[PDB]
Structures are given as structure tokens and as C-alpha cells.
Symmetry: C5
Amino acid sequence: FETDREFILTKIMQMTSVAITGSLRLFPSERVLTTNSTFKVFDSEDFIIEYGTTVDEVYIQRAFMSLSSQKSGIADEIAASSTFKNYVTRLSEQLLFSKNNIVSRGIALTEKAKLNSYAPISLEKRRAQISALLTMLQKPVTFKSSKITINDILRDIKPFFTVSDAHLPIQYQKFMPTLPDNVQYIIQCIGSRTYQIEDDGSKSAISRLISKYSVYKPSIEELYKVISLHENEIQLYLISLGIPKIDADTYVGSKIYSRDKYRILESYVYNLLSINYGCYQLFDFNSPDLEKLIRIPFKGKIPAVTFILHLYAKLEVINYAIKNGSWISLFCNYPKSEMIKLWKKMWNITSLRSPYTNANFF
Amino acid sequence: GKYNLILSEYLSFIYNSVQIPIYYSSNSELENRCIEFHSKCLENSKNGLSLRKLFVEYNDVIENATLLSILSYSYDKYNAVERKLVKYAKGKPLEADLTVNELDYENNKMTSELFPTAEEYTDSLMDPAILTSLSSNLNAVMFWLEKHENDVAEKLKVYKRRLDLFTIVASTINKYGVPRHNAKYRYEYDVMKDKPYYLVTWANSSIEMLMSVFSHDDYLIAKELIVLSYSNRSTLAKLVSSPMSILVALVDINGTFITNEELELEFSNKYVRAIVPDQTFDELNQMLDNMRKAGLVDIPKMIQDWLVDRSIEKFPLMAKIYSWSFHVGFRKQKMLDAALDQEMYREYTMLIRDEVVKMLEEPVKHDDHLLRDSELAGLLSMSSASNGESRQLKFGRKTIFSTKKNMHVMDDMANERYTPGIIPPVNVDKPIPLGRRDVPGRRTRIIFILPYEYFIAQHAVVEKMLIYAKHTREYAEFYSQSNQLLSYGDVTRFLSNNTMVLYTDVSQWDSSQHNTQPFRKGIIMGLDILANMTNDAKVLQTLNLYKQTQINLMDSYVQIPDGNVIKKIQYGAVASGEKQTKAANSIANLALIKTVLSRISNKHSFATKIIRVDGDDNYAVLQFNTEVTKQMIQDVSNDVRETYARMNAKVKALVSTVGIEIAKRYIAGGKIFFRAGINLLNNEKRGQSTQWDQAAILYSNYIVNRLRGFETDREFILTKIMQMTSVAITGSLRLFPSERVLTTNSTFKVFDSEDFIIEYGTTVDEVYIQRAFMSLSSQKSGIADEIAASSTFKNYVTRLSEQLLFSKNNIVSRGIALTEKAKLNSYAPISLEKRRAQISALLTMLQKPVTFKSSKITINDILRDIKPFFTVSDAHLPIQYQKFMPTLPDNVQYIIQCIGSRTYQIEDDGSKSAISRLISKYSVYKPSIEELYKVISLHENEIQLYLISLGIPKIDADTYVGSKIYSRDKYRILESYVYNLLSINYGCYQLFDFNSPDLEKLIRIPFKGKIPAVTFILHLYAKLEVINYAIKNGSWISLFCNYPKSEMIKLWKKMWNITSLRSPYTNANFF
Amino acid sequence: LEKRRAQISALLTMLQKPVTFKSSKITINDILRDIKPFFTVSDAHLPIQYQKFMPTLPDNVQYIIQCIGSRTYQIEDDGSKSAISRLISKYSVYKPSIEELYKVISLHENEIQLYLISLGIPKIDADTYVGSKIYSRDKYRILESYVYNLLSINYGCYQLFDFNSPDLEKLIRIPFKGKIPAVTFILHLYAKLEVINYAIKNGSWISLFCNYPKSEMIKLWKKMWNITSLRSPYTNANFF
Amino acid sequence: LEKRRAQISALLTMLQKPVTFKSSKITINDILRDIKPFFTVSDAHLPIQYQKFMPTLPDNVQYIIQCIGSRTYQIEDDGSKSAISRLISKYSVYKPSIEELYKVISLHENEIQLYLISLGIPKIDADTYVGSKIYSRDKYRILESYVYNLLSINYGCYQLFDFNSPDLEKLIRIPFKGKIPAVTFILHLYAKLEVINYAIKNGSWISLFCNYPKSEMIKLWKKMWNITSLRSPYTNANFF
Amino acid sequence: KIDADTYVGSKIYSRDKYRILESYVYNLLSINYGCYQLFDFNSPDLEKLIRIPFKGKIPAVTFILHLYAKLEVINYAIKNGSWISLFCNYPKSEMIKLWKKMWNITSLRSPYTNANFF
């Protein structure tokens, strides 16, 4: 089924606009609407996701994150009553031993993230957001940016990729005849997968250990923050949950832990690229056919950077395919010096909540 | 997604008189479209025209953009409650039997009776203390009923139950009308004057409970407590709970988990017959009778039915009762009443002294730097210090009413008044003010209010004491990173048919006038022994000053109020308020059990397998050279109680063979249980949190309860968040923030769109908004800056530093200033100024952004990068681990069943790194994880100076800078920082074994290169993704990662540039 | 229209007063700002050797081509030429963007394996990639494509510059502190862009030296996998 | 006054409604948040061995010194002790901040070489640094100084803590997945801060374990070289 | 293509990854403008004041720690007249997190800051 895209654009125009007066509505622009953020509604080209490449996009990109999470004059007071404190402590007292607060801080927000549901909070936050949002379009120019995201990381790698026309023949037949031609073309050339790409870190040794002994379940974000810690700190975390010291100590040193550092990042990155939702979930991103179109020399066995350059390489080629019907081959001569700067950035990427983007259908 | 739509029902429900949605988007073209749609909507509404055509004309906006918030133009009075409530006032109001409370004012009399005149009234005895209104709760409840007035089958039954009960509330409230709340959400004298004083708090508790009912039993329980609570407000909670202690002893143990040599929960098949003596049964009958003679009917009956077979399979109910009894409210009695309740100690005090010595034996002889410079450390700690009287101050050319102890140091230093060597006397001349701590089902306890000289003379010694505790298992609260699970396993461990367990409730003993002499004598005696161990003036100075704190305390008078007047009585009991409180209290409690246990030995011969302390409870599993008989348990218990009696101490000394109960956790049936009674609609005290934070705190509380047992309907919570977050820009226009604004990971994040699951910006919009929110995250305070402008702040910082630095310390110096500028806001004029100003920025923020110079990266940006490189595919995981925390929601319990759980905390502060240890070994300074993270990210040359600047010796400092250990330390600092940002230690994740062999297999990651940083995040990201899927699907998925070698370097740079997002409400950390 | 009109209220207010933002996300701006201090610039000279073939190019633009030359190819900026992508394509029809490949690649081996399965890649084959050396390199390539995309190295006037010119490469000096392909890559590209831009705004060249400490590289490496974007499509200059 | 008065309008509006920000920049907040999930905390114990010498320190603060000790030195937080800096100083009079050294170090060998020349460093000497092993290490040190600066490890109460205490180091457990000085460094410092903070807010210690996957480290490594700052000077607590 | 393919693999490309980052970082630190352009940031005298052990041959992180080390020392010098020596014990685990951050740094336009005079 295909509802005319112009009609959808019209609805978005009607649905996004907001009035500041009784005779003055403010229709948000395409850049405001499609720029990857917590307010992103659609894409300027179906099936293709863009990322701040120009200074303006990033300038606006950092600016939007600012008024992303605005406190609720209810969601805080609720954590102020003995009830919330007793409930959290009561749950923790049978979950912790040492100084668990990394775990403790998360549990509180775990509730402060759903609490808004309650009308007086969702409505209070939603109505208040309008005042901030309307004013936000007015005048910014004053933001103490310091947090980095996929937009900042990807923008860095762009200049080091050399694109050149390449060609890919159609070899795989059709089995999902409804797919729009541009989408179907990618599968015809590189194929499709019958699997989901681990995007939660569930398949890592540390996670398994945390699960084997404790009942607690830390998200990908927590595993990501925890993995980015020092061996000494990570060891206590396991103990704090219940992992036996003989076993906890074995992981901290072990070679497996180092690899586990790579896997946690991979799951976090894939999650941020929605590689499992949208139309990408239908693309074999490890296609032999797609892999040839990418050229990347191993400056050094640095699994993190080699990984992103590649994925960035793959996404770029796929997106071009969708928006052109022809393929392009990318070359990468990323200096050894640049890799270390990039490596630091990898462990400081924040998110952008918007759940609507949810396209995950199969 | 259901939250945004649900909110529409709530608004339409409340308002009947327009709703102008607001959409934003990263897309630039769509954004202008959003603005057009928005602009036209106001015009149409302010002209009384439709809007159906406009929505069709903006399907793109509705379908493709993000909802930012929903404006509401109203023009009534928000007095729809009076009108709506009447429909439910059909029932007959409740009449409180004013003949139930031992203390007159505890009775639910007419306010005009308890307080005849306005200048006499004081909501100090019933204040919900929560920034939400009773009318709101009533409104919220009515909304749910309207929505579920047609549900069918079992869903309907929940309604019938909810409908019935609510009527009790509506009917009673209606008789007196619905009390009006003022801006401060308080309840004045005029509104209250003709109504049952304890009405408002009661309605909150009744509403909180009735909106937590589902099964029939919940209804009887919510119903019985709801009714009796209206008149009984001083023993209902204590009476309903009380029997739970005896019940745990009753059930046997059919397979339980234990603690093995590697201190990890291990499933044991052991079986233990819960044998109890005849007299113990009578003790339980009396608890039942007391419950019965007090009005109860159905709840007592339930326990009675349970006792016929005492099947752990039907124990869940006993738990719901113990958890439910807490949601009746807070026992807030008059300060004086609370205060009023308050030869053979040679053996007892002797142990207390000896324990004190061990904790400080090695440090004292060596002349630990911490002991020598205790004054600086205590001074630095002030941020994590207690509280003192809200003194008067002057900085520069103004006046303030700060209550924070640290600032007092500033005023005093810059006034020659600062004199720590002279610790103020706490007696008749200069008595001790008073603070308090309320808790459901227990007599109110008081809290001293000693000046700052006391904290300073106590921080170093206590801190050194704790380190000893930290590695001593007897202190089940401190030992390593131990979580409550380890404590749970230790008890079941030795349980066998030849060993009986014994638990106690020494809460009253810790405040027994009898206790103070011994307690103080032992601490002082030990200090004396330690003093004759060193020749260091700095240490002896510290050893002596601490001793004096005890001596001044020996005779301490209390500034106890008694009306609008401040009386002044004596006080021969010990209270909390000292640094050593929690630490020293344990020393005494441990000392006490050792004393009782040794004395009882004179008769029966056993074997002390384990001994432990935990605040107001101490226990021990003792083994017997023969099988345990009912007679034996009866004899030992008697001998134990009489022994406790001889020392004239009020205590709950029980004894069992399979279970134990204590204030933090109860082990009934070999399974670990936690109470779940955190009042949601009635807070203990009015802190300094805001309405928004109040909500995020409320949601935190809700999740902890759900996890523990009690479960308030999530729709109700969503409603509260809707009420609590909304903000008005005009007198007839409120702005309800959207779900994306509310749940997107930021400094304003209140909850999650799916409990137990945390999301991260994956779409462009989320990130677009994510970067935008950080902007107006920290808005300067036109007070917090000027304060650092006076000579006072500059002198205080410099004065502290001059004895902390040598080279150019400013990295350290810059942090100390903000360390204060981060708490300073507390002061009303600053928290209120920042909070009120934030609204103007926040309201405008939703309006129009599009202009932000982003450059800072966060976890959101890093994770978004890795996502595309992970290939997910269906995988399967079998359930192998049994259950031990039966209350956990099925989806949460399922993860533990498959991957297990941990009995440890995951190092999230870098405390276990070589650099940190070095900084600690020589300097007293303590840099946070953030500082260690920034410092570690530095060049070898810079890092070397940092150590020198603090005091590390150059020979040693140079050895670290090069050494291989430093490189690894670079990895560990990052790990702790990352785990902290993922709250892997708080929330529900703290219960998951993230290193589970079972979870690890589900992840596939090739080693592109031995790059510990990137390999680490890919893995953790891999683990979180799999776990979250498990929670939201019941099935597992396996992830593959082919991250290119080139991409890893870019990612590696990002890792050392991640910023944070403060929001403390998210705090779910319960065990 | 709703988003555009509403944006104005927020935008107008935004200029007014900020000072309250919980920044934590990092971008190219934050990463590049870090590297700047470690580069030592010194006057260098480059002779004009390549003739002209696009006579219309403004002198300052034409001068760069005259000295370092031009390319007849596009720089892979979507990760399309990576092994993981090819695998996802070979079996599944789904097509994950560069962003998704970037986030996915930044994951743990265990998580990435499930992702492939979730789409349809066969387990024997999925498992082979997860370990394989090729996956590690693929981690480098995904990042490269993501970075180049963020630098619009394929659009604007840069698309006419041979960024791998032997002539441009000599002007850059970078010692291999360690075989860390990520950081070595950015330092170099940052080095190249700086030299080119100076050329455009001065007609003369400069040579850059880099003594980036080994310690600093790890901090930078973390930053690399946390860069967010900035949408603005108007910037679109891509003409040939 | 113009900036301060104007800031109020933006600030007031900011609280009102946001939801529209193009984030892409990453900070310490974003980096640390990533590492959190990979740390496993477990109760640990630390005995008090060091005596008191600053008797005024609040008990909670004094307790840390009693267990891990204190330092009589400042932690290099400006990169002043790096080879590149010394070289820039030896010949040129210019003085680039830590931020500049951080950005410069994150550059490509070719670019960094010109930077030195541009200031005056002799080419024979400039070229020797660009390649040399010392430059690689210098990349590590610049990052360390930048990170420590962002953690105010030298100001506040932390300046009184021996962050390299043998006693604190034992409480941290971190396996070397790979000799990647950057990531190993942050995990450790993050580990140390977490343990210290728990100590201050609990009187008891906790031990942290870290099993950071090898894949995750590369993503994190990129983030490290893209961290931005947050100015607020008031926070200044630096007293000794 | 023959030439393009040679670069993609070649060892030189890996180093080039390091150099691009260096130039980007130095740009963000205005190490070439302001008063810093007058300082020999590779001074033997400045280098001694910095102490950094090689946890691993990771050119990116080692680079920033050093530059951060140098800037800190210089700035202290300007605001105190005395020098300070910095030591760095960055854990191996932390370096990987930091490495990711390095390739995700965004900018901040303001051209006025332009002090570049010689």
C-alpha cells in the first residue's frame, strides 16, 4: 500500500505547526523536522537517513539537544517522598552489597522516564515544551556544547573517504515483490539477511556473567558506560551485583574482557543507527557484494575505528544506491594520528530518544 | 507512544469548553511545515473554527514529525473536581472513632478542635509534603474510572473493586468538600478548619492504595487498611506488619540458593524443616488477636488460612500484606512526644573499645596521612556532610539564610571565628537543635543537629573505620561491593537440621539511655589506647578531638520544641547526627550480639558459623552437636531474651531454623524477599526538589515498588506525570510536555516508555532534540556567581588549596569551586531563582530552536554510531536458574532465570585503579570519576605534574607515568566512567549478571585488534541490546559484529569526549 | 508548517537567554578542536605542475588543482564497500544507513552476531565474520565512511581535490605513535583539510607536524565513536 | 551587561520548550555514560592505616585519606610536560593551551609538521618529532592532561586524594584487552572516581570489575577526541 | 583504481588516519592563532615537565593526553609564573572509551576569536 507522499507531507505540516497567538501559527521547517534529533519526524528522502554534514546542521544539531529533556515539576517531587526512596532502597537492599550507585542512579531514572505517562506529567511536560520550543526557534547562539554524538563522529570520517563510480550486477532474484524498486534493487545486488543484528550487548561475556549470578539487567547504555571503565572499577561492579570474586577477577584480566569491550561498542553503535529497524533490516550488511565496494587498509589492529569506518562506508554506499540506482566505491586513507582522536570520541556518544521512528515491521 | 495519546484523553476529559498539538523535526522543510500547521491552528481555534481539515492538510506533520507538547487553552476554574466527585459521593461518609489514638492529636479529630485558632494551627502533623494536589489525585482517579467504565471480563472486576473503594474516598471527602491547595501545595488553616485534620493525607494514601488493587485480595486489603486508617493513625501499620517476623520461621526450605567460596549465589537442593516451639505459636496468636481487637477482620483471617499449611507456594499473599501495611502513611507525631520515648556492661563496652582499636590500630602507629591531616579531609568532605542550623550570613554586601554546614565554615574562616580546635559544648549552655526521620509503622526518632566542628573531628576516623569494615564480613552492610544477595546467600548457607538461626531488632536498644554510657565509654577508651601508640601531634590532636565529641555528648541537652515555643529538656540517650553514627552504631550492635551470644553459651554448646550486623538488626547461625528439637529452640530463645533483658534493653529476639526477618530484607522459605511499601502520594518531608524532579522521583519510586512487589497501575502514574510536568504560560493556558520530551535521555528525563528499559536516540529527531536539550541544561544563577566573588569564597578556596597544592593545581582548583557552586543552589533564593528562570527558558525552548552549535558528544552519539555494525538474529536461551526473588515481575524474572544474577556491584567510580590508589596513598584529596577520566586522558608529561601537585613522591610518581600499569589504568578509568553513564549499578540492571556465560554466548565479536576500549563498548552495547530485547519480548536475539578496523579509530576518539546528564531522580538503586 | 512556525518561537527565544544546557554529546567540532593544539604549522612551498582543464574555476580553487591535482572518483561515504554491509546484502534485502552500520560496528562481538541472524545471514557465515580479521578492518572502514560523510568531502569544492595527492601528502608530517588506524586517520585528514583551506585563503602552502602523545590518542579514540550529526541539506553543492 | 541581560531572555524561554536540538557534540557526560554498563561493582573493604594531619577535614573526606592517603603534588592538567609543547617553547614564544595541543595532537602527521614550522621549529627537528616514537606517547599525554582538566582532579576535594594510592588501585580490576593507553586510562580513572565517590557517600568501599569488549573500545576511542567543555569558573574550589 | 586501491590497504593510510586527527584537533585548539602561536610546543624544556607512560602504542590517545598535558602546564605558567609537572596513569580500559570520543567531536564557529597576528 502507498499513500501519496505529498499527502503525508501535508499532514506533517498540519500536525507539527504550533500557534503562539490566536492568529499566528508557526510551521517548523524541513531542516528542523528531518535533522536527526529528539524531534525528528521524517526523512527528506524516504528510506534514507541523513546526518549533519554542513556547519548549520551541526550548529542546529547541538542546539536542539539542549531543550531535549526538560524537568517535570512532578517527576522530581515524586522521588522526594518516602515512598519513592523506600521503594528504591527496598529493591536495592536485596540487590546490592558495596557502593552500587552507578546501578542505583539508573533505577531512579528508570521510573522517572515512564512517570511522565501520568497525564499531569506528560501534559505538563508537553505544554511546557511548547514555550521552550517556540522561544528556541527565536534566538539561540548561546550553548556550551561539549557532548558528542554519531553526527559529530560521522562528520569527522567523511573527509577521509574517497568515492569513485563502481558497478554492481543484479544476481539475486525477487521474493518480496512489493518492495519499492529502489529498495528491491539493493537486495537484487547485495542480498538480504534472515537475522537481526545484536543491538543490546546481550551476547557479551560480561553480560552473561552479570546474568549468571545476578538477576539485574543493565541496558546497552549501562554496559557501554561500564565497559568504558578502569579494570579496578569494573571488578567492584560485578561484586556489587553478586558475581563471585574468583570468577569476577578472572574476567577483569582475561583476554575475553578486551574483546567484550569491542562488542559492547558494536551493539551500542548499531542501536544508534537503527540498523535493525527501518528498511536496513532487510539488507545483508555483510554481503560479499557490498564488502567489495569498500576499501579499507589496516593502519593498525584497532577494532573500534576500523569498525566504524567500515560501517560508515557501507551505509554511504547503500544510501547512494537507494538515491541513484548506481553504486559507488569508497576508499579510506585515515591517518594513524587521526584514529586516536576518533577513538576517544567513540566512548562519549549520547543519544536521541524519539521512539516514533519505529519502522521495525518484520 | 501510548503515553502521548493517553494524555489527549486526560486533557479532553478535564477540559470541556482547544488542543493545539506542537510538532518539531530535524528535517528543515518539515519544520517550516510544522510551523505553518501550528500557526494556522491557533488562528482556527481563536476564531472558533474546526481543525479537521488542517490535520488532513498536515498528515505529513502528524505521521512524520515528532510531537513536542500539547498546548491547552482553557477558561473555567479547574474546579471540575467538585462537580465530578458528587457522582461518586453516593456512599456513606466514614466516621472516625476518635477513641483509638493513645496520643490525642494522633486521633482524626476536627481540625478546629486540635487547633482552635489560626495562629495555633500547623499542618506539621499531616502535610503530604508532596508537590501534587489532592484534587489532582481525585481528578486522576476519576479519569481512569471514566476510561475503564466499560472494560469487560477480569479487567472489569478491577474496575468494580476500584469503583467501590474510591466511593469510600469520594463519599467522605464530599461531606467536607475537596480541600483547596495553595501554590506551595500546602493546606492552610481556613480550608482545614472545619474538616477532619488527617483528611488530605488519608485521601492520598487511600487513593495510592486503591489505584494499586487488581485481584480480590488486593481489594480486601486496600479496603481494610483504607477504612481503619481513617481513624487509626498510630498502630495500623505496625500491627499489620508485626506478625511477618514470626511467619518467616514457619515455612521449611525446599531448595535454596547459597554462598559458595567464590561468594556467588549457588543453587543448593538442601531441605530444612521449619521447626517452631509451642510458645512461639502463641506469640503469633497474640499478634493476630491484637490485630483483631483493633478492628481488622479479613487480613487476620488471611494469615489464619495461611497457617493451616504454611506453603511457600501461597506465601506471596503474606508478602503483599507486609508491603501494603506501609502505604497507610507516615506516623508524624509532635517532636516532643517522639523525643519522650527515650556493672554488666564491662564485657559489652570492652568489645566496643577493642573493635574501635582494630579499625584504627595500624593507621595510628604508622601515622597515616589521613589521620594527620584529618582537618583538611573533613573540611573537603563538607559537601557530603550532615546539616546544621540555618544561620545568618553576609558575603560581600548582602545577607543570606544558609543552612549548609560548609558555608558556615566560609563565614567563620573569613571572620576569625573559625576555630575547629575548639568543638562547641553540646549541653545546657549550648544545647543541640533537632531534626527528625519519619517512617511508616514506627515511633518517630529524633536527629541531633551538631555544629560543623563535630563533622570535621569525625570524618577521618570514621572513614578509616569503614575501610576496616569494608573488608570484614561481620558488617554485612559495608563488606566489599556486596549487594543484599550475598547477605541472603550467607544465611541459607549453613542452614541445616543441626543449626538454628537467630535474628534481632535492636532498634530501641540503640537509643536506650542505658546504651549511651557504654557506647561512649568504649569509643573514648579505644581512642585512649590508640593515642598511646603514636607520637604524631597531628594524629594525637585528631585522636583527642574525637574523644571530646564523646565527652560533650555524655551530657547533651536538647532544644526540643513544644508548640510555638522552644522548650529545653535534658537527654540521656544517643541519637543520630554524627559521622560515626552509622559506622559506630554497627560497632555497638555487633558488640552487643557478641556479648549475648557468649553468655548463652555457658549453657548450650554450639558453633558460631556466621555473625552479622545491619543497622537495627544483628543475626547469627549457630550449629549444634545434635539435631535441633522444638525444646531446644524454645530454650535458647528464652536464654537469649532473658540475657537481653538482663542488660535492660528492649529487643525483638527471635529464633528459627529456616528464615529470618529484618528491617531491610526477609528470607521466608529459603527465598529472598524485600518490602515494597514506598508511599507514592505522601512524602516524608518537604525537601528542595522541584515539581518536575518530584515526578521523576515518583516514577523512580513506582518502579522500585513494582520490582519489589507492590504495583501502582502504570496508567495512574502516567496521569501524575502529566499533571506534575505540565507548566502554564498564561492563566488559561497550560503546556503539557510530550512523551519524547519526557523520556528522551536528558537532564529532564522523567521516565521510560517501557518500564525497565532505557532507550537512546536512534532516530535523527531524537538526536536533534537530544543535542538541543543539553543547551539550556545549566543556566547560571545570579547568586551562585556573586558568592564566589566575595573575599570569603576566594579565601576559603585558597585557604583549603594552600595546604593541598604545590605546583599549578588549577585543574584541581577549578573543580573545587564548582563543587560548591553545585550545591549552593540548595539555598532557596538560588534553587528558586534557578527553577523559576528555567521555566522561561524551557517554555521558549519548545517554541523554536534550529540554532545550536553542537560539538559535544555523549553516550547517545557513541551508541548511535555502533548500531549499524551489529547484525541481529534470533537465538534461544533456556531457563535454568531457579527463583529466589519471587516478587520480580515476570519479564524481569525471566532474565535472571536464563542468565542469572550477581551478588556484587560494578565498580563505577574508578576507586579500584592504581592511579587513584596512588593519589590516596599520599594525598587526602579525592578526585571523582570525571576528574580521573579527564586526567587519564592527558599526556604523560601533564599527568606526572598532577601527582606531584598533590604530594605523590617523584620517584614513585615517575614510576607510574611510564609503567605498564598506567596504560591499563587508562582502560579501567574509562570502564568506570561508562558504567556510571549506563546506570548499570542502579535500576533493574543491578540484578542482572552482565558477565553471565549464558549472555556472553549470545554475543559474537571478533578481535579486529587488541583495542580494549572499543572492544569493550561493542560488547556492553551488545549485552544491553540483548537484555532489553529479552525484557520487551520474552525471547532472545544473538548479535554479530563486523566493525571495520578504520571505524574503530574514529570511535576511539569519541570515547574520551563524552559529557553527562545530571538528573538524580532516576535513582532506582534499591538494594 | 506546524514545525516551521513553532520553530520560530523557540528560535527567537533561543537567541534571548541560554546558559542552561546539559551537553554531553560530541561532534566533529569537539573532536577537531581537540587535535588542533597538537599540530605545528610551518611555511612550506608547493610548485604548480598540473595544467588546467576546467578553465572556469576561480583562481584560488584552480590553484589547488594546479599544485596537488584532482580526482576522477567519489570517496566512499556510505560504507557500501564494507564486508559486513555486503553480508547483510547477500542474504537480507534490508539496507542499513552509514549511521546504522556505524552504531552496529561500535557494538560487542556478541551483539553484532545476533544482528546478522536477525536479518537472515546464516549462522555458519555470521559466526565466521564476527571473529575474522576482516571484521576488525571493517570497523575501520565504517568509521572512515561516516567521517568523510560529515566533512562533505564528496560535495562542495573538495570533490574536485585529489586528497591523496602525493604533493599534498608530503606537506603533512605524522609519526606512527602506534598502529591505531582510527586516530592516525583523523589526524591526517585534519592535516589535509587544514593545508588545503590555508591554500584557498592564502595562495601559499603550510606544512603541519604532529606529535600527538600516546596517552591523548586513547581519549580521542573514545570520542570517535560518539559523534552526532547536523542535518541541513541545503549545503548540497555536489554538482558534478 | 548586554550578554548577561540577553541571556535571561534566552534562559527563561529555554525552560519553556526545547525538543528541537541538533546534538552531535560529545562530552565527558556522554563518554562516561557509555562506560558505566561495563563496570561490575561488588562490596570490598579498606582498612584505615594512615594517621591524621589535617584534623579539620570533614569525617567523610578525612576517611578517604585515612584509607588511601594523600598527595603532595598537582596532577599535570595543561600538557606542559609533553615533548611537543617543549619543542614549541624551545623555539617559538607562542603558548598553545591544552585545548590547542589537544586539537593539534589529534591531527595527521603531515598537518602537525607544518604547525611546528609555522611557529619556527627547525625542519630537521620538526621532522624528527613527527615520526619519532615520542610523538605517539605525546598523543597519550595531551589527552591525559585534557581529561584531568575536565574532571577538576586538581581543584575541589580531589586535590587532596592520592589517586594513585596502592590501596585505591587494588579496589579496581581491569584486564588489558589490548595495549590501548587511551581507553585503558579512562576506564581506570572512571573506576577510581566511582570508588572514591561511593566512599564519601557511604563510608564503605566497593570494588569494580571491567570486561569492556574489544569492539566497544574502538567506538569509545573515537569519542575521546571530540569532547567539548563547559566554562563555569565559579566551581573554582582549588584552595591549597 | 590501481592507485586508489594501493592507498586503501597501505600502511601509509593508517598513519594518515593519525595525521588527519592531529590537524583537526590542533585546529580546535587554535594552537596556531592567539598567543600559543608564539610557543614552542615541542620544547625540550616543556616536554620534560610532562610524564606519560605508553600503556599501548595508540597514537591517538597518547597524543591528546600529551597536548592536554602541555596546554595545562603552559596555562599554569601564564597564570602563576611557576611551573607544574603532570603525571598520567590513564588505564588501558579508559583509552578505548576515549578513542571512540575522538572521532565524534563537533565545532564552534565564532571567527572573531581570530588573534592570528603574525
